[PDB]
Amino acid sequence: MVRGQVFDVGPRYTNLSYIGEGAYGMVCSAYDNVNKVRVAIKKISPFEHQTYCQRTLREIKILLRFRHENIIGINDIIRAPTIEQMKDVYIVQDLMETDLYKLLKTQHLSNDHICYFLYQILRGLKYIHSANVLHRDLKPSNLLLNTTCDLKICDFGLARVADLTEYVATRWYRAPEIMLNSKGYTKSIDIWSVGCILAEMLSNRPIFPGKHYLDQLNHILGILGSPSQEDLNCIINLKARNYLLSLPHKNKVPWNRLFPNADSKALDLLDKMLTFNPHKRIEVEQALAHPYLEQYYDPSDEPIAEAPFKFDMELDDLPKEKLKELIFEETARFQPG
Ligand SMILES: c1nc(NC2CCCCC2)c2nc[nH]c2n1
């Protein structure tokens, strides 16, 4: 009953209004008759793809487990009373006003706003990393804003514990290690993404907007300069590594030439986030303690996870039928009664 597609969430949730498409599929706002407020509802239909089931379970378990101001929560989950009838899962979340993507398309951000948004992203990410989780897909459209400039990190479908080749909407925020298909990357890939986001807040345009695969790397090299053999220390394809090492030498472009109006402390931190070498890259607590964020940094007011997150049984090996059973179990607490 919206865009010709089924959206069965009533009677508690009424007055459906189309917002847009996932990621997972249709997203609507709806009136919550119990809580007298409008909410957001994501419809997910994953049970025919093994990887969609992984994404959905991951999403649900992680968001249900996390509790943090800067991370979206899950209010409610709708699905059929029997597992046989369960074809769709509806995830209810607080309605946010916008995301960083749309904001950056229309608005210029004061230095104070850039600084505070950055703080909130890193504050939330500090919690994430403290649960031994990598988000793996940080980008402006996954950063939601409310009316009072409160920022929440969203979409943990691609998140894994810190111990692909699939389609994603954009790769402009992936670390070089990810682009080069390395097998053994760390929390530092998330820091890279945040740096890309920082650059975009400073200029209102993506810093590394590649048109295609190899072009993405050329954009990176064209600004950071040629990487050293030491910078390329990840387990990566030999031929890819050789190709990269043989490209025309690029000199590092100074930050103040790309961002001639940016706070000089912001550019210093930016420099630390966008380092080619992952081991050289700044960590989340170090980034938080950078002079740029000094007016917000407060380790007594930056919660970490009660315990490192652990999928007690691994997910990528389960047949999609078993994943559906786990999804059924994880959502049963939201059923009446
Ligand atoms: C996706 N979109 C939303 N709202 C839109 C509204 C239009 C501007 C962009 C954000 C959401 N609110 C809570 N979770 C959401 N997931």
Curated annotation (Swiss-Prot):
Sequence motif: Nuclear translocation motif, positions: 307-313
Coiled coil regions in record: none
Phosphothreonine: residues bearing it: T165, T170
EC number: 2.7.11.24
PROSITE patterns per record: MAPK (PS01351), PROTEIN_KINASE_ATP (PS00107), PROTEIN_KINASE_DOM (PS50011), PROTEIN_KINASE_ST (PS00108)
Effect of K42R: Does not inhibit interaction with MAP2K1
SUPFAM superfamilies: Protein kinase-like (PK-like)
Principal subcellular localization: cytoplasm
InterPro entries assigned: Kinase-like_dom_sf (IPR011009), MAP_kinase (IPR050117), MAP_kinase_CS (IPR003527), MAPK_ERK1/2 (IPR008349), Prot_kinase_dom (IPR000719), Protein_kinase_ATP_BS (IPR017441), Ser/Thr_kinase_AS (IPR008271)
Residues in Protein kinase domain copies: 13-293
Span(s) of short sequence motif Cytoplasmic retention motif: 298-302
Effect of substituting Y167A: Inhibits interaction with TPR
PTM field: Phosphorylated upon KIT and FLT3 signaling. Dually phosphorylated on Thr-165 and Tyr-167, which activates the enzyme. Undergoes regulatory phosphorylation on additional residues such as Ser-226 and Ser-228 in the kinase insert domain (KID) These phosphorylations, which are probably mediated by more than one kinase, are important for binding of MAPK1/ERK2 to importin-7 (IPO7) and its nuclear translocation. In addition, autophosphorylation of Thr-170 was shown to affect the subcellular localization of MAPK1/ERK2 as well. Ligand-activated ALK induces tyrosine phosphorylation. ISGylated.
Active site: D137 (proton acceptor)
Effect on the protein upon substituting D298N: In NS13; results in increased MAPK signaling; increased translocation to the nucleus; reduced interaction with DUSP6; no effect on interaction with MAP2K1
Location of this chain's protein in the cell: Cytoplasm, Cytoskeleton, Spindle; Nucleus; Cytoplasm, Cytoskeleton, Microtubule organizing center, Centrosome; Cytoplasm
Physiological role: Serine/threonine kinase which acts as an essential component of the MAP kinase signal transduction pathway. MAPK1/ERK2 and MAPK3/ERK1 are the 2 MAPKs which play an important role in the MAPK/ERK cascade. They participate also in a signaling cascade initiated by activated KIT and KITLG/SCF. Depending on the cellular context, the MAPK/ERK cascade mediates diverse biological functions such as cell growth, adhesion, survival and differentiation through the regulation of transcription, translation, cytoskeletal rearrangements. Acts as a transcriptional repressor. Binds to a [GC]AAA[GC] consensus sequence. Repress the expression of interferon gamma-induced genes. Seems to bind to the promoter of CCL5, DMP1, IFIH1, IFITM1, IRF7, IRF9, LAMP3, OAS1, OAS2, OAS3 and STAT1. Transcriptional activity is independent of kinase activity.
Oligomeric and partner information: Binds both upstream activators and downstream substrates in multimolecular complexes. This interaction inhibits its tyrosine-kinase activity. Interacts with ADAM15, ARHGEF2, ARRB2, DAPK1 (via death domain), HSF4, IER3, IPO7, NISCH, SGK1, and isoform 1 of NEK2. Interacts (via phosphorylated form) with TPR (via C-terminal region and phosphorylated form); the interaction requires dimerization of MAPK1/ERK2 and increases following EGF stimulation. Interacts with MAP2K1. Interacts with DUSP6. (Microbial infection) Interacts with HIV-1 Nef through its SH3 domain.
Entry comment, domain topic: The TXY motif contains the threonine and tyrosine residues whose phosphorylation activates the MAP kinases.
Disease link: Noonan syndrome 13: A form of Noonan syndrome, a disease characterized by short stature, facial dysmorphic features such as hypertelorism, a downward eyeslant and low-set posteriorly rotated ears, and a high incidence of congenital heart defects and hypertrophic cardiomyopathy. Other features can include a short neck with webbing or redundancy of skin, deafness, motor delay, variable intellectual deficits, multiple skeletal defects, cryptorchidism, and bleeding diathesis.
Protein name per Swiss-Prot or TrEMBL: Mitogen-activated protein kinase 1
Taxonomic source organism: Homo sapiens (Human)
Lineage, top ranks: Eukaryota, Metazoa, Chordata, Craniata, Vertebrata
